[PDB]
Each structure stands twice: as structure tokens, then as C-alpha cells.
Write a protein that binds this ligand. Structure first.
Ligand code: HEM
Length: 398
């Protein structure tokens, strides 16, 4: 009675309906035959996300500990990553979140509004021809320029950063090319850190160096791991939020009208896109330190849990009978948790909301008649089981 996730992501819509149906705790299989549990309902997901018995520490994974996980298992980079904010819980995690919150403040993100507006303008200025790949030509570059600027990376590096991001995020990318891509990116982050120690500025890197709580502060290794984690966490997710809002407005033309008229605000489009069509379908991975009741089921000690944000986004218990539809007018007594919940909640939420909040009005300002150059049915998800990313967004600028 175990749902196997399509590594080709041929039918997300259905796979998400099957996960919602298989109760709050669904037995699933990850690509490579690895069995785990998925929490697929909203209220149960919030309970597990704040339960200190669900930890990131891979030592707690019984299957891993007793060697039944292939060392070449494709998803092992997700299950077993380098030490960061991502992989710790309890006091160690609270220390990192406190220090990071001092640097990536709502104020610092809000202060990016003008630079993002200018980066959006220049990308739109480069769009030419009657149809474009709006993903490759507009959405894709925007978050790279934004994060480079946020982090204070040498503007000279941007042409190479474009190539390193493509390599880091690409399916095709081979074995010891991805080793070498990580190495080069870490070298850039280390240079940026050393630059900002010598000459502190108004950038996130400078603030991560300055952050402290009663004389406790981040190590160089902690600062670099934080900058790398933010690039990994923030790039394709923000692209897919923009891509998915354009896809949603295009297939709900009466809501596009409502937003273009000024009756509906852009925030309502972004918040609805996040609930209805999150860029992050699944987050790996947590392990139970003890048996944990979830509904009428038990998550056993040493078993794995994934959080199925995609599926639970359209949870009718949270969002009512409309849950399964895109509606930017909707009222929910339950805010979406597409940025997570509890200690590990996304620290980038304000920034991705700001990028989309600037990009979407700017694009429709330049091309208010823009639409899909192809039927919605022809749009393809990339073969990335944890993400909701499209190969391309063919658009007629109009
Ligand atoms: C639409 C865009 C994004 C979405 C949908 C997204 C979603 C998420 C979610 C769901 C989590 C928590 C996963 C869990 O614990 O179950 C998370 C964590 C994180 N995200 Fe975001 N995120 C987005 C953008 C960004 C941006 C722009 C940045 C960085 C500036 C970022 C950095 C992070 C980091 C560092 C974490 C790890 C937090 C921790 O474990 O303590 N994300 N993201």
C-alpha cells in the first residue's frame, strides 16, 4: 500500500491527490526503492515540524545505520549533507538561527526592493522576439543577480556565477564536474567573506560576520556553509515561484484580469501560487528518535519522514472545499506552510516574496497581454522528484 514517487515527475497533480488520500501519514517509496513515510495533511505536518522527536540527524535513520542504503543512491546528497543550519536541531540549531536572523533581517530584504526593481527592468529590456522562454530569459537569471548583490559577491564574478549555478542545478552535470563546481563556488564565498572582514559593508556577508549573541558568533566555515545553503535553497525555488505564478494567471484569465485591473493585489497571487503550486513538493528528511503517533498510525523509532508540502498545499481540511483550485480571492483561517513551520522555517521567505512581488508586476507592466505560447498540457516538469520546476515557459509577450 506504498506510493512510489515518479523520478520523471510525469503526473504531479495525481501523485499529490494519491498522497492526500493515503491519510496524514502515507507510506511512500523514494526513487531507488528507498521506503520512507510522508506527512501529506496540513495540521499533522505542523505537529511533526514542531516535534523535537523528528530530527535531521542521519545517525537516527535505522535503514542508513544498518547499511541498507546504496552509497551511490542518487538522493544521498539530500539525506546526508554537509553540516549546516539544515542538518542540526535543538540548541545548536537555535544558535545558528539566532545569528542568521541578525543578518537576513526583514529590513535588509526590504532594502533590496530598488536593486531588484532595477535588475527586473534590465532583464525585461533584453527580452526580444514574439515568443520567449520566460524561464530561461527572465525568471532564471533574476534570483542569481539578487543573491549575488545581497551577499556582496564581486560584480566581476557574475558571468562565471551564471555558469556555476547552471552546472550546480543541472540534471546532466556529471560526477567530478559537480565536485569542481562546489569547490569553485566555495572559493568565491570564501573570497567574499575575506573581502568583507577587510572592508565591512551593507551586505548579508558583512552582517553574518558581525552577528553575535553574548560574544558567540559564526565561524568562517559556518558563514560559508550558510551562503552556499542559501544559494542551493533559494535559486530554483524562487524561479519556480515566478514561473508558477505566470502559469497560474495564464490558465485563470479572470483572476489575471482581477490583478491587472488592480482589484486584486500581487501579494494575493504570490501567496496563492505558494499554497496551490509550491516550488518544493517534498523536503528530505527527518528521522524519529521514538515512536510518534500521527493520526491512527505510528511513525516508528528510526524511520524516515518527508514533508509533502506540494500535496498538503491543497488540503481541504485547511483551505475548505475550494482547496483543490487556484483562487487569489480565497480566505483561509489557515495560512499556507509552503515555507515550513517551527524551528526550520524558511529564512528566505521575505526575500522570495519580494523577488516575485517586484518581478510579476514589472513583467505584466511591460507585456500586459503576455500569455503561454503553448497549451498548459505541453508544459513539462523537470525530473527532480522533490521540486515542482518546468523545463521551459514558452510565452507570447503580445
Ligand atoms: C519560493 C521560494 C522558497 C521556498 C518555496 C522555500 C521553501 C523552504 C522550506 C519549505 C523550508 C523548510 C523545509 C523543512 O524544514 O521542512 C526551507 C528552508 C530553507 N530555505 Fe527556503 N524556500 C524558498 C526560498 C528561499 C530563499 C530565497 C532562501 C535564502 C535566502 C532560502 C533559504 C532557506 C534555508 C537556508 C533553509 C533552511 C532552514 C533550516 O533548516 O533551518 N529559501 N525553504
Amino acid at each position: 500500500t506504498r506510493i512510489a514517487l515518479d523520478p520523471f515527475v510525469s503526473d504531479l497533480e495525481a501523485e499529490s491527490a494519491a498522497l492526500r488520500a493515503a491519510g496524514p501519514l502515507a507510506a511512500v517509496e523514494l526513487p531507488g526503492g528507498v521506503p520512507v513515510w510522508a506527512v501529506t495533511h496540513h495540521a499533522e505536518a505542523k505537529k511533526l515540524l514542531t516535534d523535537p522527536r523528528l530530527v535531521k540527524d542521519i545517525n537516527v535513520w535505522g535503514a542508513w545505520q544498518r547499511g541498507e542504503i546504496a552509497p551511490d543512491w542518487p538522493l544521498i546528497g539530500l539525506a546526508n549533507p554537509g553540516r549546516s543550519m539544515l542538518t542540526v536541531d535543538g540548541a545548536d540549531h537555535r544558535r545558528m538561527r539566532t545569528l542568521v536572523a541578525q543578518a537576513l533581517t526583514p529590513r535588509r530584504v526590504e532594502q533590496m526592493r530598488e536593486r531588484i526593481t532595477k535588475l527586473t527592468e534590465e532583464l525585461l529590456d533584453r527580452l526580444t522576439g514574439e515568443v520567449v522562454d520566460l524561464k530561461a530569459d527572465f525568471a532564471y537569471p533574476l534570483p542569481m543577480y539578487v543573491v549575488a548583490d545581497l551577499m556582496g559577491i564581486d560584480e566581476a564574478r557574475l558571468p562565471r556565477l551564471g555558469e556555476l549555478f547552471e552546472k550546480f542545478f543541472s540534471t546532466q552535470t556529471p560526477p567530478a564536474e559537480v565536485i569542481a563546481t562546489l569547490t569553485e563556488l566555495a572559493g568565491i564565498m570564501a573570497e567574499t567573506v575575506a573581502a568583507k572582514r577587510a572592508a565591512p559593508g551593507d551586505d548579508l556577508t558583512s552582517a553574518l560576520i558581525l552577528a553575535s549573541e553574548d560574544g558567540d558568533h559564526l565561524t568562517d566555515a559556518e558563514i560559508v556553509s550558510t551562503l552556499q545553503l542559501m544559494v542551493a535553497a533559494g535559486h530554483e525555488t524562487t524561479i519556480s515561484l515566478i514561473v508558477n505564478a505566470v502559469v497560474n494567471l495564464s490558465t485563470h484569465p479572470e483572476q489575471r484580469a482581477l490583478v491587472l485591473s488592480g482589484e486584486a493585489d500581487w501579494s494575493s497571487v504570490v501567496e496563492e501560487t505558494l499554497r496551490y503550486s509550491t516550488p518544493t513538493s517534498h523536503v528530505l528528511i527527518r528521522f524519529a528518535t521514538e515512536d510518534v503517533p500521527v493520526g491512527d498510525k505510528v511513525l516508528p523509532a528510526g524511520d524516515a519522514l518527508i514533508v509533502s508540502y506540494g500535496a498538503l498545499g491543497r488540503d481541504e481540511a485547511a483551505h475548505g472545499p475550494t482547496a483543490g483550485e487556484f483562487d487569489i480571492t480565497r480566505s483561509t483561517e489557515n495560512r499556507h506552510i509552503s515555507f515550513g513551520h517551527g524551528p526550520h522555517v524558511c529564512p528566505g521567505a521575505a526575500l522570495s516574496r519580494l523577488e516575485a512581488g517586484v518581478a510579476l508586476p514589472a513583467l505584466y507592466a511591460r507585456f500586459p497581454k503576455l500569455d503561454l505560447a503553448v497549451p498548459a498540457a505541453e508544459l513539462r516538469n523537470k525530473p527532480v522528484v522533490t521540486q515542482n520546476d518546468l523545463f521551459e515557459l514558452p510565452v507570447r509577450l503580445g
